[PDB]
Paper text:
3FTxs, non-enzymatic snake venom proteins, are the most abundant toxins found in elapid (cobras, kraits, mambas and sea snakes) and colubrid venoms. Structurally, all 3FTxs have a stable fold with three β-stranded loops extending from a central core containing all four conserved disulphide bridges, resembling the three fingers of a hand, and hence their common name. Despite overall similar fold, 3FTxs recognize a broad range of distinct molecular targets resulting in diverse biological activities. In continuation of our efforts to understand the relationship between the structure and function of 3FTxs, we isolated, purified and determined the complete amino acid sequence and the crystal structure of a new three-finger toxin (hemachatoxin) from H. haemachatus (Ringhals cobra) venom at 2.43 Å resolution.
There were two hemachatoxin molecules in an asymmetric unit with each molecule consisting of residues from Leu1 to Asn61. The electrostatic surface representation shows that loops I and II are predominantly charged residues, whereas loop III is highly hydrophobic in nature. ESI-MS, Edman degradation and crystal structure data indicates that hemachatoxin differs from cytotoxin 1 in two amino acid positions (Leu27Met28 is replaced by Met27Leu28) and hence are isoforms. Similar to these P-type cardiotoxins, hemachatoxin has the conserved Pro31 and cytolytic site. The three-dimensional structure is similar to P-type cardiotoxins (RMSD values, 0.8 to 2.1 Å for 58 to 60 Cα atoms; Z score values, 12.2 to 9.8).
Author numbering:
A (entry chain A), B (entry chain B): 1 to 61
Write the structure that this text describes.
């Protein structure tokens, strides 16, 4: 799997064994700006301030 | 281990087996506001926009 791993566009990495999900964190009030992206094994939980998208195709985050 | 797990004060949970670190995410420009907190096994990486503290004593985050 390959995921975007920076908050600028395009850049990516191949995920390590065990992490088969891409994730994207955004501020709930600003959905257009990724604040943190990368690979993960289990999808991180959202908070009152942060939304977390998880997806499992290449560069889907 | 017990960690703060919300961005309001006080609230906490006991970490599941395998997660022996507390973490706190902040926006690099706003260190005073936690945007996401909880338990983790390996300390999450920082990004250009987000700082991540990790610590291993009770409610240290």
């Amino acid at each position: 799997l390959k995921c975007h791993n920076k908050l600028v566009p395009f850049l990516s990495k191949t995920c390590p064994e065990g992490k088969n999900l891409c994730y994207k964190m955004t501020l709930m009030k600003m959905p257009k700006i990724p604040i943190k992206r990368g690979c993960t094994d289990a999808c991180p939980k959202s908070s009152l301030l942060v939304k977390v998208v998880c997806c499992n195709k290449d560069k889907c985050n």
